[PDB]
Design goal:
The structure is a homotetramer.
Chain A (H helix, E strand, L loop, with lengths): L2 E7 L4 E2 L4 E7 L5 E8 L18 E7 L1 H8 L5 E10 L7 E8 L2 E8 L1
Parallel strand pairs in A: 1-7
Antiparallel strand pairs in A: 1-2, 3-4, 3-5, 5-6, 7-8
The structure holds 2,4-dinitrophenol (2 copies).
One 2,4-dinitrophenol (DNF) sits at the interface of chains B and C.
Amino acid sequence: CPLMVKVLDAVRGSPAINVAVHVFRKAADDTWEPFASGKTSESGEPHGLTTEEEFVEGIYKVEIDTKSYWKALGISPFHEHAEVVFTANDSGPRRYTIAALLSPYSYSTTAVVT
Amino acid sequence: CPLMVKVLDAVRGSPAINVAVHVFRKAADDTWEPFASGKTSESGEPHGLTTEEEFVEGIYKVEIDTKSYWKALGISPFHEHAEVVFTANDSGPRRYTIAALLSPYSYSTTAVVTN
Amino acid sequence: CPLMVKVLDAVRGSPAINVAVHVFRKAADDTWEPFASGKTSESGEPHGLTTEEEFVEGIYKVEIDTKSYWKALGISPFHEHAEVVFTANDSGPRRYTIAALLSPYSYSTTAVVTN
Amino acid sequence: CPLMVKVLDAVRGSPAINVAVHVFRKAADDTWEPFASGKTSESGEPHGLTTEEEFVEGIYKVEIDTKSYWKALGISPFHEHAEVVFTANDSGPRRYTIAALLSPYSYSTTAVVT
Ligand SMILES: O=[N+]([O-])c1ccc(O)c([N+](=O)[O-])c1
Ligand SMILES: O=[N+]([O-])c1ccc(O)c([N+](=O)[O-])c1
C-alpha cells in the first residue's frame, strides 16, 4: 500500500475506530476528484486505500470525518473534519502513512514517509 | 476581533512570520468563497481578519500557507497548507483563535473559543 | 517575565484554568530544586513566575499538573503531569513561553523563545 | 510486550532512529529506579522493553533522549529530553504504546491503550 492512514483518539487513548476517511486527488480544473476512501478498523486504519499503479505524483487531499466520530462519542467537536493536503513525490521507494491524533478541539497530523 | 489565527514554528521555536492566511466561507451553492486573508506579523498572527458584523454563522475554512513558508526557510515540506474547517457562531457569536504549530512534515492545530 | 507558561484544554477548546505549574532548576548536586510555582488564570497562564534576575542559566523543568486538572473536570487521564525540561539562557537571557495543549491521553508542548 | 514506545520525526517525516529511551519506575522513596531502556530501531521503536510479569501497576517515567537525537541531525533543539510520566493501571487486558512525535522545539506524545 503506497498510502496508509492511521487515526488515534487522544481522549480515549485508543485508535479511532469507524472513522470515515475520504481521499481526493487534484484535477486539472483544480477540483477535487474522489480517489479513495474507507473507514478505519479496530487498528484505526482504513484497509487498502490505493495501489502502486494509481498513486501517481499529484496533489492529494485526505479528509478524516472527525465530526461524526466525536458526535458518536457524544462530545461536541470543533472541526467539520481534518484535512491533510499534500503533493505525492517520486524519489526512490516511499510509502506514505498519514497519521492523525484527534481531540475534540484540536488535531495533529504527521506524515511518515519510509 | 472575533477570528484570530496564531502560527508557531516548531523548528525555530518562534512565531511563524510572513505566513499567508486565507479564510473562506462556504457559499449557498456549496462552494468556498473568499472571506478574508492576511499575513502573520512578528507575533505569528495576521491582524484584523474580520469584524463581528461580517463574521456571521457559516462553515469557515482557514488555510494557512505552510508550504510557501517552509520553502522561504529552505525546507521542503510535506503539506501544501494546513486547513482548519469549522462551523462558527452556531450558538451565537464566539471569539475564535485558531492556533497552528508547524513542522516540516506535521502540524497541529487547536481552537480556543471564548464567549 | 522571562518565563511564561500557557496551558490549553483540547477537549474544551479553552485555556486550561486553575492548573498548578511547578518549576524546578537542577541543583549543583544534580537534584531538582524548587524554583517557582503558580496556577493558571483564565487566560491559561500563571503570572509572574520569575524575574530576569532570578532566572539565570540552568537546566529547568516545568511540571504542569495535568492529572489534578483532568480529575477536577471528571476525566481519568493517562499522564501524571506534563514535563518540560530545557536548558535556559545558555546564549544569554531569552524570554521563554512554554505552551502545552492538553488532552486526556496526550499532550503537546512547544516553546517560543525570543530575544 | 505490555509497554511499547514509538518515536517519530516531524522534520524528516520518518520514524526517529537510534533514539535512546529510558524507562523508570517510581520507588517508595519517590526516587526513579531504572526499569527498562533501549534504542529505537528503523521503525522508531525500541525492542522488548519489559514483560507482562514485571510491568506491574506503578508510576512510570519514559524518557526519550531527544536532544542527542537532534544534535546528531545537526539541529539545535529546545528540550533536554521528552518525559512521559504515567500510572499503569490494571483493568482488563491492556497494552501501552507511548508514541512521541518530535520536533526541535516541540513534541507531542499520546498513549494508545489497546
Ligand atoms: O500555541 N499554541 O496555540 C499551540 C498550538 C498547537 C500545539 O500543539 C501547542 N502545544 O504544543 O502546546 C500549542
Ligand atoms: O503516532 N502517531 O501517529 C502520532 C501522530 C501525531 C502525534 O502527535 C503523535 N504523538 O503525539 O505522539 C503520534
